[PDB]
Amino acid sequence: GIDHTSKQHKRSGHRTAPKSDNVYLKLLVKLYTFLARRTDAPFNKVVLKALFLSKINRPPVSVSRIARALKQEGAANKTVVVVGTVTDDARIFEFPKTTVAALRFTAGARAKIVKAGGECITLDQLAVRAPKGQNTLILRGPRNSREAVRHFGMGPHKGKAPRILSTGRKFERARGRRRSKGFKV
């Protein structure tokens, strides 16, 4: 017998592979598993882990988010890296000329980047030209703006969104939401 301080046989709880069966994604993982092992550049390990992520955990990255990132001083010539999808954003009217490396590009995003004079690159071409992630800018989309996140942690005085089908008057706007009817949460 052993007085176990920790739970036995506990899995790490981190993805060690993509749940996806996409063969090309698994080839990209084959590439960055090699690069993470045979280089000491932290970029390769970060990209590898991002390659494992689920869909909600790799939100879209907008071209305007990329352009804002390129406004960081000393960052205007960095290769933006997005382990995910880059979407188009018509709310920006001046896009800079830059090389963006991403898993997926939408048609609008690719057209906007190319029309700016820039380049759209796959992650393997990024691995060829920046094996240690040289001069790279990893960008991530907003995880907590998901609709599902609105409803997490619901409870009195927490101010989250109730899980509700129909909205408007008559749908949870009464006793429990105003002092005139009972109380307010």
Partner: protein, 148 residues
């Protein structure tokens, strides 16, 4: 499909995952929303506050079409011009040739002011506009023409 369900794995195990003691029964707490004010009060006040009780005025014979008014913001205002012809107006920004944007034919009732359009004059035809949206359009050199 059936072969991936836990029913298949529970075969050979007596209680079918329902417990020996609790012993899955028909409707142990009632059917539907029973007891929402009595024995389901805590759940209902925790997750659906405001559920019970009444609220303001009633509207007999409400037709939603009376209220049709899709909003469009200025930051999306220039998307109503097709991409092929958009860049020509964005350059050479001047009056006497300014893009007429009919936001009603685009399916919009009111123009709101989320703001930061380019400094190009545009003629915005709309049923309704917010006060700030008309400020930004005028500041850019355009105008809003009230239509019906």
């Amino acid at each position: 499909p059936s072969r991936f369900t836990k029913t298949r794995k529970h075969r050979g195990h007596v209680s079918a995952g329902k417990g020996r003691i609790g012993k899955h029964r028909k409707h142990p707490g009632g059917r539907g929303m029973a007891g929402g004010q009595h024995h389901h009060r805590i759940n209902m006040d925790k997750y659906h506050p405001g559920y019970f009780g009444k609220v303001g005025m009633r509207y007999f014979h409400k037709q939603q079409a009376h209220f049709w008014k899709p909003v469009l913001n200025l930051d999306k205002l220039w998307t109503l011009i097709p991409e092929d012809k958009r860049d020509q107006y964005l350059k050479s920004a001047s009056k006497e040739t300014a893009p007429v944007i009919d936001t009603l034919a685009a399916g919009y009732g009111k123009i709101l002011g989320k703001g930061r359009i380019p400094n190009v004059p545009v003629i915005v035809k709309a049923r309704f506009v917010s006060k700030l949206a008309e400020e930004k359009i005028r500041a850019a050199g355009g105008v809003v023409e009230l239509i019906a």
